[PDB]
Amino acid sequence: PGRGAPLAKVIFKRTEKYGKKEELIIASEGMFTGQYISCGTKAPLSVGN
Amino acid sequence: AQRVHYRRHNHYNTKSNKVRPVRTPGGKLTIHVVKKKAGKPKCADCKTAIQGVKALRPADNYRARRKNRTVARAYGGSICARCIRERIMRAFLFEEQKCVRQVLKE
Amino acid sequence: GSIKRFRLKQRLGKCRRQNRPVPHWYRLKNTKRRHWRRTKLGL
Amino acid sequence: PKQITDIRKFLKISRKPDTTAVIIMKKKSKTVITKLKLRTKKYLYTMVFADRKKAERIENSLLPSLKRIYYP
Amino acid sequence: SRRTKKVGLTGKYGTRYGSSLRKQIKKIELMQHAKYLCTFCGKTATKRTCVGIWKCKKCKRKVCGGAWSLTTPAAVAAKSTIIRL
Amino acid sequence: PSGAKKTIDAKARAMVGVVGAGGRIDKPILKAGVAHHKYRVKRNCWPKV
RNA sequence: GUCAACUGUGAUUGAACAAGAGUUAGCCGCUCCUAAGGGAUAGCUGAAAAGUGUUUAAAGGGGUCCCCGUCUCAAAAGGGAAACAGGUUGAUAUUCCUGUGCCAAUAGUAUUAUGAGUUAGAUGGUAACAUAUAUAUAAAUGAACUCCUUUACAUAGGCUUUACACUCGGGGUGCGUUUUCUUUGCACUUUACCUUUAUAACAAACCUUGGAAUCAAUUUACUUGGAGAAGAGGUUCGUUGAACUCAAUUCAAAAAUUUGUUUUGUAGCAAUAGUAAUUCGUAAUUAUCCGAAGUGGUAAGGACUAUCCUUGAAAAAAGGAGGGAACGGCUUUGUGCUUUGCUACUCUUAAUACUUGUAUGAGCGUACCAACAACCGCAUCAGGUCUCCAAGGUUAACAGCCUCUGGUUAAAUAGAAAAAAGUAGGUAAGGGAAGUCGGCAAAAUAGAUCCGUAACUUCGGGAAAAGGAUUGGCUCUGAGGACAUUAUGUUAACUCAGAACUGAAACGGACAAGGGGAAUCCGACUGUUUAAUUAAAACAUAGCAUUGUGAAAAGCCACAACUGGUAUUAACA
């Protein structure tokens, strides 16, 4: 309610530990549930990366 | 008829304090506070209620017999059979693809 | 109100105990008496 | 309370040491009918016998040590 | 429908409130409550479920979009630009 | 989006595409009740007087 | 008991006064948990007092050296483990009593019984999914480490299902009216939790078959479908809570386990308890307790639908899934580990015994009032003061009006008189605002059905405009269902529309209930405000517009200082 922007729930996998971790990202227009999102230097150019 | 009186203490009609009047063997109209409505067990990835599994308050769910709490096949009461199928198919295809790509690359 | 805790309970019984008039057997060898509506305990 | 539909189960419950007493009552003639209520510490079991004579014979034959309770 | 001569859905607001604003509201409100076509499943069931969020009923999938309709031009132009190279 | 130009380090991150819910301030605000609900989840910044 | 004072009159009365008595909980609350919050630690500032609260941390918990990781108080209406019925006292009772139950536990070792598995970890069902009925539905290999889910949520609108309530009609009991008339009026005809409650029933969900356009199925509402509908056959959840062959029995057929007929049962609880009775003794017995159905007032559920530049707490607590650490009993060398030899055993609930501090149920609350005198207003003060239960007739109606159940007939006085004057009221010939700053006051108007409705307007309204008509009682006429015989029957609620007759032309017969029109001026609007002389033309408001500000060395503001707030922020700010 405070934010003007939708939030996006993104699941990442732990790398120093086992199991799945959830982060809270700010949504971008055209983002969707079941989308694969990439983050990093070696990420490809695409919306919401 | 007669009016009712509260019996259960904390005499308010809140969401957890909802009531059925009943007439007794003494012919008296008395009151019972019913147990609260409880959400159903669900498929996690679909976010929807699942077959077979009883819907019970956590007190009743603690006493409940073990057959009632879950489903026998695969990932049991956590996810549904259609969800399980999709994951099995996907898991099968990805391994097949992985080997073909390894053969392909050089 | 209806609900109370041990210290209040004890004190009220104490005040009740206290209120009773002076005994006449002592007298033959004064009083402060409380009336509930007119004088409140103020606890 | 739980009703019982099998004489063999009724006897098998009766034989347990948790049984304390048996209670008998016979109801209104329409033809008469007999409710025999058996008292274990855990529960009061009821068996409905159409014939009083059968019910009474079964009750006498069962454990003659245990207390018998009569409502009239 | 044929009830109103030309006001339409802002007839709910009636005689109260300035007319030009009611016309502006009419355009937004018409866009807001339309059932849009879902790209994923091929049915016209995509509705706005919260301010930036549009869910299709049939396939149960939430697309993040514009405020009053699914898409702005801006995102499309960006999307095409990324695709072309 | 203010029009400001800025020079920043190359390694600083950002997220591809535009923020969701575009056009938010372009629906006409009908009434005072709408303003009450908007500020209800924000703070005691309204009415200004 | 009682009458000194008080009980603004009397008083034997009393919430006054004196003496005593009275509040019993594993199951009802608090008690436990976190929230909005409060207090501290770590620090750091401040002469100290204090200001702060992870912000330069070598501080609390779990496993078998590792992994988590500030603490604590804060809801008697959020979350939350578990009990009801009848009876009982001078005053309490979910607590005493009687019955039935339910809940959390319940250590060690040894016996015993209960089912599993063995020569080490069950099965069914194509499927969705199911399966331990032992007194007792008890155990259906599983460690670290994980991943989920219940807890757990807005508002509005209808539809639908049940319950309680209400009603009508029949039989049965007793009581009432009873000149005359009444095949009558009334009362009573009761049934709880609990038993993975057992089943039936139904809105949904899911699955097998099936393969749909000439679209069909289909709700009050629109919904659904090749990402598989209708159809056909299942299965589940949730409501519910003895419905329905449900269970037992009989005789006939499959059969030397299913279906039809007979006999039982308020499913057990359950009648012995309740209730109306009925006799007898002067405490005991007897007789009774059930067939049809409608109304839709409450509440709960369900499937939904619609809206928000608003999408509407959390944790404690509990459950499910992934994973695959570990692994027979008896005997012994060698080195807990390994080779030799043996095989009713290994698990698992419950009961029992013996040992181990005394191996079951903590603690506090529970009276009465809740203002019609117990609370606050200096006081038995016409003021104020939070929540739920909600009967009949009338009706749109839980309004107003009268009535049954329950309550009351007391209000700081009484009597007698009846003029002025006062005050709350009525009513007035002819006129009709000419009185008075002012139509102020009062009255007129008002409900339904049928007609009819302008200037003007942002075309949405204006609007109940204006302006008309009708409305009782009675006896009918017409229209709207459900079942089952192939055009004919059996049968229920009520609402509508029309025609006569009728009467002091009277009927929204009390009752509730708008005065209207022509205009101007101001403010657009819903909103807000001078508690106790002020509701508006003032404030807010949408709309229009401006300014500053790109971030920890920013804007703007707060702090003594350190530091905060805007900020869980980010120029659509």
PDB file of N, CA and C (backbone and C1' of nucleotides) in Angstrom, chain G residues 256-270:
ATOM      1  P     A G 256     -21.487 -71.318  -0.148  1.00  0.00           P
ATOM      2  O5'   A G 256     -22.588 -72.459  -0.220  1.00  0.00           O
ATOM      3  C5'   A G 256     -22.457 -73.583  -1.115  1.00  0.00           C
ATOM      4  C4'   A G 256     -23.434 -74.719  -0.749  1.00  0.00           C
ATOM      5  C3'   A G 256     -24.883 -74.257  -0.461  1.00  0.00           C
ATOM      6  O3'   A G 256     -25.882 -75.155  -0.986  1.00  0.00           O
ATOM      7  C1'   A G 256     -24.045 -75.328   1.444  1.00  0.00           C
ATOM      8  O5'   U G 257     -19.752 -61.926   3.581  1.00  0.00           O
ATOM      9  C5'   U G 257     -19.523 -61.277   2.321  1.00  0.00           C
ATOM     10  C4'   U G 257     -20.502 -61.711   1.211  1.00  0.00           C
ATOM     11  C3'   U G 257     -21.923 -61.145   1.303  1.00  0.00           C
ATOM     12  O3'   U G 257     -21.955 -59.794   0.816  1.00  0.00           O
ATOM     13  C1'   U G 257     -21.964 -63.445   0.667  1.00  0.00           C
ATOM     14  P     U G 258     -22.551 -58.584   1.628  1.00  0.00           P
ATOM     15  O5'   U G 258     -23.876 -58.279   0.813  1.00  0.00           O
ATOM     16  C5'   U G 258     -23.812 -57.495  -0.407  1.00  0.00           C
ATOM     17  C4'   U G 258     -24.726 -58.031  -1.532  1.00  0.00           C
ATOM     18  C3'   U G 258     -26.225 -57.755  -1.310  1.00  0.00           C
ATOM     19  O3'   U G 258     -26.564 -56.404  -1.717  1.00  0.00           O
ATOM     20  C1'   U G 258     -25.939 -60.015  -1.923  1.00  0.00           C
ATOM     21  P     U G 259     -27.748 -55.664  -0.953  1.00  0.00           P
ATOM     22  O5'   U G 259     -29.058 -56.370  -1.508  1.00  0.00           O
ATOM     23  C5'   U G 259     -29.710 -55.915  -2.719  1.00  0.00           C
ATOM     24  C4'   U G 259     -30.836 -56.862  -3.205  1.00  0.00           C
ATOM     25  C3'   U G 259     -32.111 -56.792  -2.348  1.00  0.00           C
ATOM     26  O3'   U G 259     -32.929 -55.649  -2.708  1.00  0.00           O
ATOM     27  C1'   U G 259     -31.543 -59.057  -2.755  1.00  0.00           C
ATOM     28  P     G G 260     -33.821 -54.992  -1.561  1.00  0.00           P
ATOM     29  O5'   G G 260     -35.109 -55.923  -1.459  1.00  0.00           O
ATOM     30  C5'   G G 260     -36.113 -55.932  -2.501  1.00  0.00           C
ATOM     31  C4'   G G 260     -37.135 -57.075  -2.313  1.00  0.00           C
ATOM     32  C3'   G G 260     -37.961 -57.170  -1.005  1.00  0.00           C
ATOM     33  O3'   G G 260     -39.097 -56.266  -1.024  1.00  0.00           O
ATOM     34  C1'   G G 260     -37.048 -59.283  -1.491  1.00  0.00           C
ATOM     35  P     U G 261     -39.551 -55.528   0.311  1.00  0.00           P
ATOM     36  O5'   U G 261     -40.297 -56.663   1.136  1.00  0.00           O
ATOM     37  C5'   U G 261     -41.587 -57.191   0.737  1.00  0.00           C
ATOM     38  C4'   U G 261     -42.028 -58.405   1.600  1.00  0.00           C
ATOM     39  C3'   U G 261     -42.180 -58.188   3.123  1.00  0.00           C
ATOM     40  O3'   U G 261     -43.443 -57.565   3.472  1.00  0.00           O
ATOM     41  C1'   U G 261     -40.976 -60.191   2.740  1.00  0.00           C
ATOM     42  P     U G 262     -43.487 -56.573   4.718  1.00  0.00           P
ATOM     43  O5'   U G 262     -43.375 -57.521   5.989  1.00  0.00           O
ATOM     44  C5'   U G 262     -44.425 -58.390   6.461  1.00  0.00           C
ATOM     45  C4'   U G 262     -43.928 -59.407   7.531  1.00  0.00           C
ATOM     46  C3'   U G 262     -43.548 -58.847   8.923  1.00  0.00           C
ATOM     47  O3'   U G 262     -44.716 -58.588   9.748  1.00  0.00           O
ATOM     48  C1'   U G 262     -41.892 -60.377   8.228  1.00  0.00           C
ATOM     49  P     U G 263     -44.816 -57.226  10.567  1.00  0.00           P
ATOM     50  O5'   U G 263     -43.979 -57.432  11.901  1.00  0.00           O
ATOM     51  C5'   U G 263     -44.197 -58.475  12.871  1.00  0.00           C
ATOM     52  C4'   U G 263     -42.903 -58.835  13.648  1.00  0.00           C
ATOM     53  C3'   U G 263     -42.277 -57.752  14.557  1.00  0.00           C
ATOM     54  O3'   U G 263     -42.928 -57.709  15.852  1.00  0.00           O
ATOM     55  C1'   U G 263     -40.579 -58.743  13.218  1.00  0.00           C
ATOM     56  P     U G 264     -43.212 -56.332  16.591  1.00  0.00           P
ATOM     57  O5'   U G 264     -42.061 -55.368  16.064  1.00  0.00           O
ATOM     58  C5'   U G 264     -41.441 -54.381  16.921  1.00  0.00           C
ATOM     59  C4'   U G 264     -40.062 -54.825  17.478  1.00  0.00           C
ATOM     60  C3'   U G 264     -39.118 -53.644  17.798  1.00  0.00           C
ATOM     61  O3'   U G 264     -39.366 -53.120  19.124  1.00  0.00           O
ATOM     62  C1'   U G 264     -37.990 -55.131  16.398  1.00  0.00           C
ATOM     63  P     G G 265     -39.500 -51.559  19.370  1.00  0.00           P
ATOM     64  O5'   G G 265     -38.373 -51.228  20.436  1.00  0.00           O
ATOM     65  C5'   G G 265     -37.041 -51.777  20.384  1.00  0.00           C
ATOM     66  C4'   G G 265     -35.981 -50.780  19.896  1.00  0.00           C
ATOM     67  C3'   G G 265     -36.310 -49.265  19.888  1.00  0.00           C
ATOM     68  O3'   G G 265     -35.508 -48.551  20.863  1.00  0.00           O
ATOM     69  C1'   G G 265     -35.315 -49.923  17.835  1.00  0.00           C
ATOM     70  P     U G 266     -36.197 -47.547  21.877  1.00  0.00           P
ATOM     71  O5'   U G 266     -36.639 -46.340  20.934  1.00  0.00           O
ATOM     72  C5'   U G 266     -35.667 -45.311  20.635  1.00  0.00           C
ATOM     73  C4'   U G 266     -36.160 -44.339  19.541  1.00  0.00           C
ATOM     74  C3'   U G 266     -35.053 -43.324  19.169  1.00  0.00           C
ATOM     75  O3'   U G 266     -35.057 -42.975  17.752  1.00  0.00           O
ATOM     76  C1'   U G 266     -36.914 -42.156  19.967  1.00  0.00           C
ATOM     77  P     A G 267     -33.646 -42.793  17.023  1.00  0.00           P
ATOM     78  O5'   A G 267     -32.943 -44.200  17.304  1.00  0.00           O
ATOM     79  C5'   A G 267     -32.332 -45.024  16.288  1.00  0.00           C
ATOM     80  C4'   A G 267     -31.000 -45.686  16.730  1.00  0.00           C
ATOM     81  C3'   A G 267     -30.560 -45.555  18.193  1.00  0.00           C
ATOM     82  O3'   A G 267     -31.278 -46.512  19.015  1.00  0.00           O
ATOM     83  C1'   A G 267     -28.731 -45.105  16.790  1.00  0.00           C
ATOM     84  P     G G 268     -31.466 -46.088  20.537  1.00  0.00           P
ATOM     85  O5'   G G 268     -29.968 -46.079  21.042  1.00  0.00           O
ATOM     86  C5'   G G 268     -29.452 -47.236  21.719  1.00  0.00           C
ATOM     87  C4'   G G 268     -27.952 -47.116  22.002  1.00  0.00           C
ATOM     88  C3'   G G 268     -27.636 -46.243  23.207  1.00  0.00           C
ATOM     89  O3'   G G 268     -27.916 -46.939  24.442  1.00  0.00           O
ATOM     90  C1'   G G 268     -26.175 -45.678  21.468  1.00  0.00           C
ATOM     91  P     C G 269     -29.008 -46.288  25.395  1.00  0.00           P
ATOM     92  O5'   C G 269     -28.336 -44.926  25.738  1.00  0.00           O
ATOM     93  C5'   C G 269     -27.154 -44.917  26.564  1.00  0.00           C
ATOM     94  C4'   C G 269     -26.472 -43.552  26.505  1.00  0.00           C
ATOM     95  C3'   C G 269     -27.342 -42.522  27.210  1.00  0.00           C
ATOM     96  O3'   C G 269     -27.152 -42.648  28.635  1.00  0.00           O
ATOM     97  C1'   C G 269     -26.544 -41.653  25.168  1.00  0.00           C
ATOM     98  P     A G 270     -28.328 -43.100  29.606  1.00  0.00           P
ATOM     99  O5'   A G 270     -29.665 -42.855  28.795  1.00  0.00           O
ATOM    100  C5'   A G 270     -30.884 -43.069  29.533  1.00  0.00           C
ATOM    101  C4'   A G 270     -32.079 -43.149  28.595  1.00  0.00           C
ATOM    102  C3'   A G 270     -31.988 -44.118  27.387  1.00  0.00           C
ATOM    103  O3'   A G 270     -33.259 -44.767  27.204  1.00  0.00           O
ATOM    104  C1'   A G 270     -32.666 -42.070  26.644  1.00  0.00           C
TER     105        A G 270
END
